[PDB]
Design an enzyme around this catalytic site. Sequence first.
Site, short mmCIF file in Angstrom:
data_model
loop_
_atom_site.label_atom_id
_atom_site.label_comp_id
_atom_site.label_asym_id
_atom_site.label_seq_id
_atom_site.Cartn_x
_atom_site.Cartn_y
_atom_site.Cartn_z
CB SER A 1 -0.95 0.13 1.16
OG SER A 1 -2.00 0.75 0.89
CD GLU A 2 -0.99 3.66 -3.21
OE1 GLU A 2 -0.90 2.20 -2.93
OE2 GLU A 2 -1.33 4.33 -3.91
CG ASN A 3 -1.43 3.99 2.96
OD1 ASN A 3 -1.49 3.19 2.04
ND2 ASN A 3 -2.13 3.94 4.24
#
EC number: 2.8.3.5
Lengths: 462, 463, 463, 462
Positions: free
Chosen positions: B291-293
Amino acid sequence: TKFYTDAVEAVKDIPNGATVLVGGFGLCGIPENLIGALLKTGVKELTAVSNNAGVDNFGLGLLLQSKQIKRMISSYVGENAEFERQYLAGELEVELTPQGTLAERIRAGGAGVPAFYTSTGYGTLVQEGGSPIKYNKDGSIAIASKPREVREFNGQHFILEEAIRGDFALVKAWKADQAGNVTFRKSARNFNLPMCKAAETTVVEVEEIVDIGSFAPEDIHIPKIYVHRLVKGEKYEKRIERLSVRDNVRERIIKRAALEFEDGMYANLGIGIPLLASNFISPNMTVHLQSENGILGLGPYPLQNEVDADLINAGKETVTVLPGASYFSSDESFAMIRGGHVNLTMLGAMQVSKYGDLANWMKGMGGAMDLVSSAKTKVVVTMEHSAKGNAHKIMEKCTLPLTGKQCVNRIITEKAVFDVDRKKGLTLIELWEGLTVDDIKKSTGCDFAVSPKLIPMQQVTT
Amino acid sequence: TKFYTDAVEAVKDIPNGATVLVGGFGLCGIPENLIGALLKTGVKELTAVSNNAGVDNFGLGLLLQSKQIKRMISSYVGENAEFERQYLAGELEVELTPQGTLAERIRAGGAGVPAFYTSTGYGTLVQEGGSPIKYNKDGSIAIASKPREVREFNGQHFILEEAIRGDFALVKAWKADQAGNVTFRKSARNFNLPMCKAAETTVVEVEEIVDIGSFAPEDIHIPKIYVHRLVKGEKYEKRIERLSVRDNVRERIIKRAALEFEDGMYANLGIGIPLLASNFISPNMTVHLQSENGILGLGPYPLQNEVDADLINAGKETVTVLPGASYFSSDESFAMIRGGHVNLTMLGAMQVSKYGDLANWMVKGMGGAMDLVSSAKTKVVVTMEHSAKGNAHKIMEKCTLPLTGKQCVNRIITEKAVFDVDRKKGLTLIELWEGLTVDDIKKSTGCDFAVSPKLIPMQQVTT
Amino acid sequence: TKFYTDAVEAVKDIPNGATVLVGGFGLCGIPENLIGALLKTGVKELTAVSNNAGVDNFGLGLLLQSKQIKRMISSYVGENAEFERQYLAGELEVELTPQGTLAERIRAGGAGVPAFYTSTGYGTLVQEGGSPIKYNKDGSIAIASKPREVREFNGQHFILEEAIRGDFALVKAWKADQAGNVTFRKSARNFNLPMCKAAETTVVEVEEIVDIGSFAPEDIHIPKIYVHRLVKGEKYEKRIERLSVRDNVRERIIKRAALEFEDGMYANLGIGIPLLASNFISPNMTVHLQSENGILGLGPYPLQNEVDADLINAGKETVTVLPGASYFSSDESFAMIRGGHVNLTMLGAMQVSKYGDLANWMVKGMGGAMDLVSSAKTKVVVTMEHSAKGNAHKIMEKCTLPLTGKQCVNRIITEKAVFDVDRKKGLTLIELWEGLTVDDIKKSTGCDFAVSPKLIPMQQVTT
Amino acid sequence: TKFYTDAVEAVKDIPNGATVLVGGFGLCGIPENLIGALLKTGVKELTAVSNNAGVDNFGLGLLLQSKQIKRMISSYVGENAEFERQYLAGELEVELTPQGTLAERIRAGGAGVPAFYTSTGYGTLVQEGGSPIKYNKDGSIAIASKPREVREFNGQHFILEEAIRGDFALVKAWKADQAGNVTFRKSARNFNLPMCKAAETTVVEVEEIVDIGSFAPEDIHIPKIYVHRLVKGEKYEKRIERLSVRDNVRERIIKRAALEFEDGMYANLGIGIPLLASNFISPNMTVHLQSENGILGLGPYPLQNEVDADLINAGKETVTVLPGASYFSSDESFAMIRGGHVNLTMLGAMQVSKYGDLANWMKGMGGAMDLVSSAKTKVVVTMEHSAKGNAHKIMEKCTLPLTGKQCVNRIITEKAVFDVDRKKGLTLIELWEGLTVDDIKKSTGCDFAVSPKLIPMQQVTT
Ligand SMILES: [K+]
Ligand SMILES: [K+]
Ligand SMILES: [K+]
Ligand SMILES: [K+]
Ligand SMILES: [K+]
Ligand SMILES: [K+]
C-alpha cells in the site's frame, strides 16, 4: 524471500565482473559468511561497493587477498596493507567517494533516483576529478577519476552524483523472520540497510531466524520485499578491530574545545581532540553525540563487559550509547548530517584557510567531506597552531587537498581561537595568555581581524 | 526536544505566510491537535505541504474552512468541497505534485539534497507545466505550474524535482519517550516521518509519552534530533474517513485480473477491480500487497470491531494486515515503488495508448498513480472496460486524456480482451473473450494490434 | 523620429544592464556605427539580443571583446573565440533560442503578444531546459536554462515562448526618408525589421537619408512610428564574412539528393550536400530556394565582382538571387518556414532515429534547424553518410545526440540507401546502392526497417 | 503559382462547407471577381472569414444574398441588412471577433502558431462568451460563443486566441508579376496580405499582371510562395461605400479634444468628435494619424479628383494620406496598435466607469477592443456628459457591454475633463466655466477627486 541452508548456494551465481555491494562499517555488520562463501566460489574481478576495505585478513580484505576484486568503491580504506599494495602496484582499481555520498548513491540506486545533488565534495577533488583510480605497473596513472558536474541551487554549489546499483548485495543482518523481514543490531546496520534495496539480487545472512510475528510490523528494518536470498550465517567471529575500553599544548586545545559544548546540543566529534573534549562535558549539560556510522547518543568507551562488536564509533572504536540513543542506517545518518541537523561538528585539521577551506583527509575522505558540507552546522576545527618547522597551518589558501571550501566557522589552537567567516576571513577572539597578537601574526599565514572583545583563551573548569 | 503542555504554546510563533508541512495520509496520522491549535492562533496565508486536504471538517480541511491556507502542495485533494470551491474561486493556490515525488522532495529537504531526478511525472503535465495553481476571481489563470526540467540517464528520461523544506512541520506520532525520540503506529507513519526532518521547527504531537528506555534504540522511528517541540495531544477523535468492513462485464475483468497473481509476488492494487481481484487469490498462493501509504502485507477489510483509524489502504479504506506485514514511511514507500521493487502494479485506466501511455488520473490530483507506473521494472497491468459510453475507444493510438505515464502499461485486461503492450511494437492480442472475434476487437479498439499466434479464449480464475 | 548627426548622441543614454536588440544576420545588416558608438560610451552588462555574435572583431564581437555584454540571447554564435572563451570561463551568459523563435518572440514583443506557441524546439533541449546559460569560474553551472511549458493543439505539441522586448534596439537599415520611414536592402533586413518594433527606444543607422516622398508609401519597410532615433551611419565597411564566388561517397549522396527536386518546388537547402545538390537542378526545372535569413529565390554564388555584403545565404556565404526573388524579414521568414510553406527542407544530420527524430546541431546554437523541421507540412529530407567513423550507426532506434526535432524527418539519403521515414511505422528502405544488399544495410543501420516491395537501385541525377 | 484566365476555374474546387478567408476591409480590397465566381459555382455552407460583410449588394453581401454562407467570422458587420435579417432569423451563424485578433489569428494560422495571447477582449464578452453565434427560428439561442481562456503574464491578463486557417483564401491584390509575386495598393492591402498565408489554397485576383522584374525584390508584399492560384480580375467596379469629400455642446468637446494633440504624436482617432478634432491641429504641429485598416499618415478627406476606392479610413470614408505616409497589412496594423505604438487613441464612448472601463461598441466591435488594449497608449474618450433623460454615462460600473476594462485614461465631456486612474478612479481636472463641481457631482454617477489645479475647460484657439 528464498531461504538457503548453504551460503555458497546463495551466492554461486554471482558472475565474474559483477558489481557487488558489501555491507559493513569497518568490521561492524560485515557479511563474513557470504564473504567466506565468495572465497569458495572464486568469483573474480568484482567491483565491490563497500564503505571500507575491512582489515588485512577479514571482511573485504579476505577478497582482496584472494585477488577477487577488480575495483573497490569505498569511502575509507585505511588499516589494510594488502589493499595499499595492490592499489600502488596497479592491481586494484579504487574510487574513493565521500561516505555520505556513497550511502545516498546506494539509496538512490534502490529508490529509482538516477542522480541527485549534494554539496559534499564541492571544491574538492571529488568535484575536480584527477585522482588515480588505477595505476599502471610503471607507477603512472591508467585511470583518473572524472570530475563531477556541479550546479548552483539557492545560491549554493552542489555536485551531481549518480546512483549506484549492484548486481548483488551481500548484507549482514541481525535477525530475519520466516517471511524474510530483517532487522539490524545496534550500529551494525550502517550500509547493510540501504544496500539491501540497491541490487538486483540481495543476499542477507543473519545471526538468527525467528518466527513470523516476532517483529512488531512497525519495527522491521528491511521489509521482505528487499530480501531475495536469506541464509543464517554459519559462523560469527564477532571480530573487534579496535578494543577501546574505559602533552600540555594538546591538553589546552582539549580544554578550550570542551567549551564549545552547549546544553541540548547535537554534536559530531572527530577522533582525537574533539572526542577527548567530550570527557569534560558537565554532567549538568546534556550533549548528544552523533556517530556517522549510524548512532545518536554515543556514550563513553565500554567497561570490558560492555564491549560489543556491533557497537563502534566512527573511528571504529568499541563504544557504548547513553539512555535514549537510537541507531539508523548510513543513508539516514548522512541525511541527518547533510541536512545540517547536527549543531556542531568538531574535527581536527591539517590546515584551514583564511575563509574557512579545510584540509583534513589526504586512505579516503570517510565522512569528513559530508560532515562539513552543511552551512547549517557549525564546524569547529581543533588543531595545533603550526606544523613542524613552524610552517603555517592557518593561511591564505590550503596547500593540502581540501575536505571542504569555506566550511570552517571557528579554529581552536593552543594559541588562539579564531572565528572564521567565508566573506570576511578570520577574527581572533581568544588569545592564550602570555602570547601577544603579534605572536599570532607570526604563526599565522594570513591577516586577521582582532575582536574588540578579545579575551584570554578559556579552559573548561573540569 | 522541548516539551509543551499546551499545543498553542508549541505553535504560536508560526508566522503568517509560513510554509508548514502537515503529516497524514487521508485522516490517518494527522496532527489534529496541532491543527486545532492553529485554528486558535489564527496564523494565515500558510503554504501547507500536506499529501491530502483531510476532509471538509477535519485535518487540513479545518484550516481551509477558516481560510488560513494560501496554498496547498499536495498530491490528492479529493473529498472536499470547500477546497474545490476556494480553488475554482481563486481563493486558494494548489500545486499538485505526485505523491512519491512529494515524499522524496520532503526527504531531500531534510537530507541536504536540493534536487534529484525521478521518472515520475515525465511526459505528463508535471513535466509539461501549465496546470493552474491559481485562478483569479474571473476564472483567469493567475499562476500556472512551471514545467520541469528533463534529463536523460542510462537511456531513460527523468525530471528534476527540488527539495521541499518547511518553516515548521506539524507531525502526528504515536509515542515519544522523555528524550524526544518518537515512533509512529501502523500506517499513521506515512508523511509524518519524513516531514519531521524537513522543517526548521518540527512540532510533534503524540498519543503517549513514555520513559526513556521504553524504545529499543534500533526501533526509534524518528530520533530526538529531529523533534524540536513535543506535545501530548489533548484529544484524539480517531476519525475514520471510510469505514470498510469485511455486473458480469466487471466480474469478468476481475476474474481475469485475478490470474495476474503469482505465488511470492509483490503487488500494488488500485481500488476497484484490481483490489477486488485479490479476493480470488488462492489460499495456496502467497501474494504480498503493498500500500503506497506505507504498508506491505495488506489483508482483507476488518470485521467492524477490528477497525483501526491507524490502518487504512491507499483508497483510504480501513483494512487489516496479514502476518509478517511491515509499515514504513511515505518516502520509503515510494523508494520501494520508484525503485521497481513491486513486481506487479494493477490499476484502472480511462485510456491506454498503443504503446502503453496511460491516462488514469484527471482537479483532485494524481496521488501515487504517476509513481506507481514510473518504473520499467514493475509490470503494469491495466484493468478497464474495453470501451467508453457510446463505444468510444479507450484503447487507441494516443490518449486524449491527461497522461499518468508514457509507455508504462505492459498489459491491458478488458471484458473482451487481454493485450500485452510493448513500448516499441505496440499491442498484441493474447486472449479473447469467447464469442467475440478478432474483428470485434478491431471495431472496439482505436489502433492496430498484432494477434498472438497463441491467442487463447480469455481465462477466468477458478474461484 | 529624432535625427542625430552623432551616433554617440543617439545612444549615450543606454543604461548599464539594458536589454539591447541588435540587428543583423552574421555580418549582414549589422549596425556597425551604433555598435562603434557603444564602444565609446562604455555602457556595460548589456543583455544583447542578437541572432549571431558577429565575428571576433566585428559586429557584436566588438562588444564582447570590450566586455560590455553580460548576456547574449542568440540562435547561433559560432565563428568567435572570445565568445567561446568568455562563455566557458563563466564571464558571459548565453541563452540559445531557435532562430525563428527569436524572430517571433521579438515580433511578439513589438506586437503586444506576451506569449505564443510554436512547435520549434518541442522534444529538444529548448523544451527540456538544463542547458548552461552561465558557468562559474570553476566550471560549475551557475544558471541553467528553464524548460518550456508544453501544450497540445490539434493533436500536436507546442511549446510556449514569451515575447522579447528591449530597452533599446540598434538597427541597421538602408535608407530613411526625412520623416523617419525606413527601408532595408536585400538580405540585410533580417532581424533589423522586427527589432525596430520591439524596444522602448529604437535607434536606426542608415546608409542614406532621402527626401520625404522618395518611397512609395506601400513600400516603406518600417513606418516612422517605429523609428525613434535615426542617424546616417558615418562609416560602412561592407565586411564580408565569407567570400564565396562562383569524394565519391559524398558525390553519390549529392546526386541522389538532386533527385528530390521537383518543378515549382519551394525548397530550403542546408549548406553542404543539400546546397551542392541544387547545382544539378535541370535548367528545365524551376526550383525556388528559400534562405531563412529572409530570401526567396537564391541563385548561384556571384562572380567576384558581383559580391554584395547585403546578400548572403544562411551559411553566411555571399550569393545572388534569381529573377523574381523577394526579400523579407526574419520573423516573416520563419512564419513562412514554421507555417510549412517550404515544400522541401533538405539538410545534413549527425543522426536520425527510426521514427524520424533528428540530431543535427549540437555550444554554437541551433540556428534555424529546429524551425526548419518544425512543420509536418514540409517534407524533411536528410542527406548524410550512412555510418560514422568506426561504422557506428547514425541511423538507429534513438538518437544519442541532442535532438533538433522529434519525428520530423521524412526521408534519409545516404551513400548506401534511401529510407522513407514514417513517425508511426518507422523506416522503409526504398532505394539501395547497387552492389550492396539489404543485409549490408542491416549491418550499417541500428534499427529494423521494412523493405519496400518496389525497392530500386539507388538513383543518381543525370547531370 | 498557377495562372488562370478564368476565375471560376480558379475556384471551382472549393468544397461545400469550406472555410474561406476573404480579403477586404469594407469594400476596400475585396476580391470582387472571385466572389462573382463563387456566385457562379454555387458552393455553399461556407464559413467565411471576412473582416466585414461587404454591403447588401456587394462583396460578401453578394454571397449572403445567394445564401452561400453558413457562418461568418468577422469583426464588424454593420451596413448590411440582409446579414442582420439572416442572423436574427437563425439562418446565418456569426462569430464576432476583435479585428486585431482576427488579423493575428489569421497570421498565426499562416505562421505555424496555433495560439497566442492578446489583451484584446479581456474583461469583455470575448473573454466571457455567451454571445449568440446562432439563433433558432424561435428566437432562442442555438449556439453561444465559448468563453476564452485568460492567463496572466507580467501582471496583465491576456486571452488565448487560436489560429485561423482556411481551406481557401480569396485575395484581392494590385499587381502580380509573372512569377506570382504580389503587391497591394494603398489601404486595399488590409487583410488580403495575411489571408494569403493562412489557407491551404490561396487564390489571388489582381488588376494587372506585370513582367518578372517589375518589382524590386525588397518590395514584393506577398512572395509567390504564398500565391497558389492567380487570376487577373475581369472587372473592377471600384465601388466606394462612403464618398466623403473635403451644435455647441459637441463643438465644445471637439475644441477641448483638439487640445490632446501634441507635436510628433501618433494618434488613432475614432470617427465623430475625435476625427473632427484633428481639423484643429495647428499646421505648426506634426501629428500622425494611424488608421487600423493599415495606414499611417492619414490626411483630410479628398477633393473630388483625389477620391480613391483603395484609400479609405476606419470609418470606411474615402480619405487621403499626407507626405511620408505608409501602408501596411491588418496584422501589422494591429501589431502596431496592440504593441502600444500609437501614443493617443481618442474615441467616443457610450459609458465610462470610475476606473476606466469603457463601453462603446454594442454589428461587432471592429478594432475598438484592440485600440484600447494597451496600457502604453493613452486612451481619451470624448462624449457628451450624460445620456437622454440625463442618465449617467460616467458611473461606478458600465451597464453596457465593455469594450475594455480599466483602459480609459481621460474623459472629455462638454462639462468636464476627468483624468482616469485604474486604481484611484476619477480626477476632475477641467471644468466648463459656468458649471460648478456640484453640477458635475449631479451629472456623474460615482465620486471623483477634484484636482488642486482644476482649471476652466480649455478650448483650442482655431
Ligand atoms: K559550517
Ligand atoms: K512497467
Ligand atoms: K515509461
Ligand atoms: K516533416
Ligand atoms: K514533429
Ligand atoms: K490606456
